Design an enzyme around this catalytic site. Structure first.
Site, short mmCIF file in Angstrom:
data_model
loop_
_atom_site.label_atom_id
_atom_site.label_comp_id
_atom_site.label_asym_id
_atom_site.label_seq_id
_atom_site.Cartn_x
_atom_site.Cartn_y
_atom_site.Cartn_z
N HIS A 1 2.38 41.78 -4.64
CA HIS A 1 3.04 42.37 -3.44
C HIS A 1 2.25 43.49 -2.80
CE1 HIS A 1 5.07 45.90 -5.63
NE2 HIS A 1 5.03 46.43 -4.44
N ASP B 1 4.77 38.70 -9.95
CA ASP B 1 4.08 39.81 -9.24
C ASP B 1 2.95 40.39 -10.09
OD1 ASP B 1 3.75 41.62 -7.21
OD2 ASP B 1 5.41 42.91 -7.75
N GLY C 1 4.88 53.71 -4.32
CA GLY C 1 3.50 54.23 -4.44
C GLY C 1 3.03 53.97 -5.86
N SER D 1 3.72 51.21 -7.54
CA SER D 1 3.55 49.73 -7.68
C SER D 1 2.12 49.35 -8.15
CB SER D 1 3.75 49.02 -6.32
OG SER D 1 5.13 49.04 -5.95
#
Ligand SMILES: C[C@@H]1CCCC[C@@H]1Oc1cccc(-c2nc3cc(C(N)=[NH2+])c(F)cc3[nH]2)c1[O-]
Lengths: 9, 246
Positions: free
Chosen positions: B46, B97, B196, B198
């Site tokens: 993502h 992800d 932030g 991630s």
């Protein structure tokens, strides 16, 4: 030296 | 990271900072990542999905600050950007992800080991710590949900893994969480990962090694009661990682 995963020095 | 402590990269030497170049002159932070081997950094699909132009990203290893330089840092270009085919986002969750970035310096090399640059270990097939284990997360993400800027100094915090039964309770996330995800929270819902953070690492000691157990993926709010952070369960993606890192 070389990488040793997971080791902080 | 909400709460936590400010730290330096020596304390998280496998952490990689990914930025994007803009036409106009600015470079902005995108996501965190982790160094798995000399030439490969793992993060979250993502983080790139919306702008999968590899040439515009920059990866830095050995960085303790966000926009100022750290002595010892290494800068890399993204030679390959591998996103997970089957990645899907819904109203909250991100499925599969995980992404891999093959890095190359302007001199044609991959990372070199130092006191600020180290790889993190991968778990063995479907092997995870048991719930209740304290793991650490690190990142340059927001310090409060209402902030619109990221901290300049790297932060870290400790959170504990919780069970799927607890995370899948209707008042937590219900069936949004799958077996391919992991949940972790602070017993007192005081510290957590936030926007932030991630792509960054969820590190736990497993069989004596500091292991990359999860990748920061999503969560509703940050440090909200009954809303744990959800991470991609790396142990369940080993065949995929091997498939592209051989
Ligand atoms: C999707 C773009 C790609 C480029 C810039 C980053 C952005 O990615 C994001 C945009 C908006 C929110 C997030 C995000 N929310 C997040 C929430 C949590 C949490 N546990 N509370 C987290 F750990 C990471 C998150 N990352 C996020 O990663």
């Amino acid at each position: 030296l070389k990488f040793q995963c997971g080791q902080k020095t | 990271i909400i709460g936590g402590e400010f730290t330096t990269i020596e304390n998280q030497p496998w952490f990689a900072a990914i930025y994007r170049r803009h036409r106009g002159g600015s470079v902005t932070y995108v996501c965190g990542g982790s160094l798995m081997s000399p030439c490969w950094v793992i993060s979250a699909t993502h983080c790139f999905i919306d702008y999968p132009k590899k040439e515009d990203y920059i990866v830095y290893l050995g960085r303790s600050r966000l926009n100022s330089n750290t002595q010892g840092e290494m800068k890399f270009e993204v030679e390959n950007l591998i996103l997970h085919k089957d990645y899907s986002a819904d109203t909250l969750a991100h499925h599969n992800d995980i992404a891999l970035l093959k890095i190359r310096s302007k001199e044609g090399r991959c990372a070199q080991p130092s006191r600020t640059i180290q790889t993190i270990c991968l778990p063995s097939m479907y092997n995870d710590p048991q719930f209740g284990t304290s793991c650490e997360i690190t990142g340059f993400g927001k310090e409060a949900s209402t902030d619109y800027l990221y901290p300049e100094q790297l932060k870290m915090t400790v959170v504990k893994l919780i069970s799927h039964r607890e995370c899948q309770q209707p008042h937590y996330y219900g069936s949004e969480v799958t077996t391919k995800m992991l949940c972790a929270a602070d017993p007192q819902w005081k510290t957590d990962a936030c926007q932030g953070d991630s792509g960054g690492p969820l590190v736990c000691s497993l069989q004596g090694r500091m292991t990359l157990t999860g990748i920061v993926s999503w969560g509703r709010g940050c440090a909200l009661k009954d809303k744990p952070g959800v991470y991609t369960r790396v142990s369940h993606f080993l065949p995929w990682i091997r498939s592209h890192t051989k």
